[PDB]
């Protein structure tokens, strides 16, 4: 019974129930619980996910010590989340020196050099997206953005990770699209209250990643890794490092994590962005004019062109402030240490509430408002990089940050070049967030899509 | 399923059954299984305790790298054996830097200086032992040595660990003697086949150490730690270091481990020694003459006197060669490494079969024989310290080695000064070892005890 740890350390927080801890407070949701605790407890507080002690920190210097300074020494890993199977070799799931071998093996794939090589392949589906949009624009019926963006996010993934070129919106039957289309609480709740059952689920071959999908994928790599190019994508870039090096099953696990990390992240954020532009027409028009100025006469976007649109980058950053889809950052304290004046005992999970810090008035003026001008080159300097942490920070931040930014902007440039977006009767205004544990709209975003000539 | 690990590494061993591994081979016993594998497989082999891979090594240089050279870096911990409770803080059970804090905190207690201070207290019960022996010597009926030695081993423990002076043979009702009097397979078998159930047993407060005993002890320390000497033993020596330092519950756990490590180890070996001397009268008389020469006219043994009897030390060492009560040494490989030419992957338990190496003809002539002359100052030089490992080796060897040697010899000097030991009709000749997992006689040792005048 570790429930006295925080009152023994003199750390405030909600009183834990036996076995359950504080998990019943998640009824309002992950983020609201972080916001309430931040308001009534202060800069540091603790709570129990079952019997697991979780210390929340909000001091920008302390966050830097955890995420950057003492990353390799103490705060190296995340906490386990369930029976993982062979996916223990995924970089996002690996720990300690095993992870350090993968982060080093996989860093050159996300170079700005390899990123520019992927733009033409993913720009091909920016045209595929706009084409699937012209039909629903003449259809005259509102559009569920998560379906078109999800198809686009899928079409970019398969081409960038395997070269497989599909119109997943128009080819919902390709065996490569069904499996890839495959959170919630009815399981992962019990995992946190019963983490002593994770070792049981492992020996039963029960995995959080379905056995239906993974078998198709390790064997669909089995054909296309060798027997296909045995005569620029994420797969080809990792193979070149095999020839301390990556294994076969290791390489499969890393590619599976890229699809998971790319599909319902790109499309979720892109759906959030279009909701903001439709409900803020001043911003959508101002962006459409910057898009038209840099790219005159519906010109195609390039690598260097995207990194030039400042208002586009300002719209992306501010949407990520309101909606950091990761919600929290977490590190497991590997040993007794003392960071910036307080003692963290071994085993305690240190947590940075990204969603709560993104909406704290201590740093944000009118936090509920969508105001891209906070990221103007005048005011971007006044933003603490350890308060605004949409991609994390330190040696274990989001490795696909620059890919995600480029992929999302290339979709927005093409989409806003040809269309305008307006709210409908079905448009949830104000948008309500999911009550679960996924930073998604409560009800899917539906907007009117008008064609620009 | 890690059952292919050793045939993937090209390492020989018995083929594992699903789930069970090689545990069914323990029917002949722990040591016989090690002896057979050593004979038919060679210097290195592997086997599975359920799903846990265990690599056995017999190369003296490789054993030094595991036990000494790469102890702190890689081979630091032992493997978990069951639900342990608060006894996770015991030095023998602690891991990594937590153990290093305890081994450093507890090393000064086992100084030769503190050891000489304990001789008068434990010599007091060497007289208590001889007194309980004179009655059974005039009784004329054979003596179960494990009862008298167990009582003596208990009377030394309570006085050296708490100052409690009891005649546990004559006071079997003292509340301090019953609890301390409290392996086998019907549980620890399933723990190795179901190690995924250890986390379950922990949350159920189910502990390998009974809740009946520990509560009496943490609270019997609660009175005598403070409320008794609040106005030389293992307890007083640890308290002086509290006043990074030892905690209250930590101090209780270390004292509990000393009783466990001292009771059925001292008395078990002492029972083995008296069996050897009774069935080898040439050695018993030669020792009784050395005991009489150094200590003329039944003189009391002292610290410096004990370290002077060479044949006594030779009898103790050779009995420990035939019966290393630990049977094996073990270390958990903390990370992928390469020791003396072969690759050990992370998680593999490295095992040194002490019992098998103590009876290997590659280093031992007539290994089944009791021949104390192997440890003569002429031939002691030809004994590899990494073959003969009764107390382990390296930074995590037996911390109470010099205490155990002094405590056993002080019993033998007094006992052989007053008595002689001869086999009976009940004396199991040849002595059969336990078929279980405890290096003990199959049937308890019973010998005729004659009084010397
Ligand atoms: C809008 C898009 C995305 C957002 C907001 C996002 C956010 C994040 C965050 C907050 C983390 C945790 C960082 C930390 O703990 O300090 C993370 C980790 C990670 N992300 Fe992303 N991500 C996005 C897209 C992607 C994409 C497209 C990929 C790959 C193609 C990717 C791959 C990863 C990986 C592998 C990790 C784990 C890194 C490690 O543990 O070494 N992410 N992401
Ligand atoms: C004939 C008597 C004894 C024998 C043969 C013996 C043997 C051993 C062996 C083989 C080990 C493992 C060493 C290794 O893994 O390298 C060990 C560990 C240990 N022994 Fe003993 N022992 C004896 C008596 C004692 C006594 C009397 C005490 C304390 C009063 C004691 C305390 C310990 C402790 C604490 C450890 C664990 C050390 C650590 O993990 O840091 N032993 N013993």
From Swiss-Prot, chains A, B:
Recorded catalytic activity of this chain's protein: an organic molecule + reduced [NADPH--hemoprotein reductase] + O2 = an alcohol + oxidized [NADPH--hemoprotein reductase] + H2O + H(+); 17beta-estradiol + reduced [NADPH--hemoprotein reductase] + O2 = 2-hydroxy-17beta-estradiol + oxidized [NADPH--hemoprotein reductase] + H2O + H(+); 17beta-estradiol + reduced [NADPH--hemoprotein reductase] + O2 = 4-hydroxy-17beta-estradiol + oxidized [NADPH--hemoprotein reductase] + H2O + H(+); 17beta-estradiol + reduced [NADPH--hemoprotein reductase] + O2 = 16alpha,17beta-estriol + oxidized [NADPH--hemoprotein reductase] + H2O + H(+)
Annotated localization: Endoplasmic reticulum membrane; Microsome membrane
Iron listed as a keyword: yes
Effect of residue 319 to M: In allele CYP3A4*11; unstable form
One GO CC term on file: cytoplasm
PTM comment: Polyubiquitinated in the presence of AMFR and UBE2G1 and also STUB1/CHIP and UBE2D1 (in vitro).
SUBUNIT field: Interacts with PGRMC1; the interaction requires PGRMC1 homodimerization.
Family statement drawn from the similarity comment of this UniProt entry: Belongs to the cytochrome P450 family.
Miscellaneous section: Chimeric transcripts, characterized by CYP3A43 exon 1 joined at canonical splice sites to distinct sets of CYP3A4 exons, have been detected. All are possibly produced by trans-splicing. The chimeric transcripts exist in 3 different combinations: CYP3A43 exon 1 joined in frame to CYP3A4 exons 2-13, CYP3A43 exon 1 joined in frame to CYP3A4 exons 4-13 and CYP3A43 exon 1 joined in frame to CYP3A4 exon 7-13. The longest chimeric isoform (CYP3A43 exon 1 joined to CYP3A4 exons 2-13) exhibits 6-beta-hydroxylase activity, while a shorter isoform (CYP3A43 exon 1 joined to CYP3A4 exons 4-13) does not.
UniProt protein name: Cytochrome P450 3A4
Record organism: Homo sapiens
Lineage: Eukaryota, Metazoa, Chordata, Craniata, Vertebrata
């Amino acid at each position: 019974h570790s429930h006295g740890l925080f009152k023994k350390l003199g750390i405030p927080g909600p009183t834990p129930l036996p076995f359950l801890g504080n998990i019943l407070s998640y009824h309002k949701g992950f983020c609201m619980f972080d916001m309430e605790c931040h308001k009534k407890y202060g800069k540091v507080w603790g709570f129990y996910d079952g019997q697991q002690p979780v210390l929340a920190i909000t001091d920008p210097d302390m966050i830097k010590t955890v995420l950057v300074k003492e990353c390799y020494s103490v705060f190296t890993n995340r906490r386990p989340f369930g029976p993982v199977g062979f996916m223990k070799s995924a970089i996002s799931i690996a720990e300690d020196e095993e992870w350090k071998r993968l982060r080093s093996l996989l860093s050159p794939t996300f170079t700005s050099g390899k990123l520019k090589e992927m733009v033409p392949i993913i720009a091909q589906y920016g045209d595929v997206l706009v084409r699937n949009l012209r039909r629903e624009a003449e259809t005259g019926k509102p559009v569920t953005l998560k379906d078109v963006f999800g198809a686009y996010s899928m079409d970019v993934i398969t081409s960038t990770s395997f070269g497989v070129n599909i119109d997943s919106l128009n080819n919902p039957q390709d065996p490569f699209v069904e499996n890839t289309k495959k959170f919630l609480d009815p399981f992962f709740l019990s995992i946190t209250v019963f983490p002593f059952l994770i070792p049981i689920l492992e020996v039963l071959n029960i995995c959080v990643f379905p056995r239906e999908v993974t078998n198709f994928l390790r064997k669909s790599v089995k054909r296309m890794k060798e027997s296909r190019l045995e005569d620029v994508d994420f797969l080809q870039l990792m193979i070149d490092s095999q020839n301390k090096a990556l294994s076969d099953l290791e390489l499969v696990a890393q590619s599976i994590i890229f699809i998971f990390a790319g599909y319902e992240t790109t499309s979720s954020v892109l759906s959030f962005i279009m909701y903001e532009l439709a409900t803020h027409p001043d911003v959508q028009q101002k962006l459409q004019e910057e898009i038209d100025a840099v790219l005159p006469n519906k010109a195609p976007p390039t690598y260097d062109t995207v990194l030039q649109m400042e208002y586009l980058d300002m719209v992306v950053n501010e949407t990520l402030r309101l909606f950091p889809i990761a919600m929290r950052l977490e590190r497991v304290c590997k040993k007794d240490v003392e960071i910036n004046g307080m003692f963290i005992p071994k085993g305690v999970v240190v947590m940075i509430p990204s969603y709560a810090l993104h909406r704290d008035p201590k740093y944000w003026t009118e936090p509920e408002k969508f105001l891209p001008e906070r990221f103007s080159k005048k005011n971007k300097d006044n933003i603490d990089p350890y308060i605004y942490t949409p991609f994390g920070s330190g040696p274990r931040n989001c490795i696909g940050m620059r890919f995600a930014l480029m992929n999302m902007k290339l979709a927005l440039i093409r989409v806003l070049q040809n269309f305008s977006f307006k709210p409908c009767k079905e448009t949830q205004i104000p948008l309500k967030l999911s009550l679960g544990g996924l930073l998604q709209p409560e009800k899917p975003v539906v907007l009117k899509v008008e064609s620009r000539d």
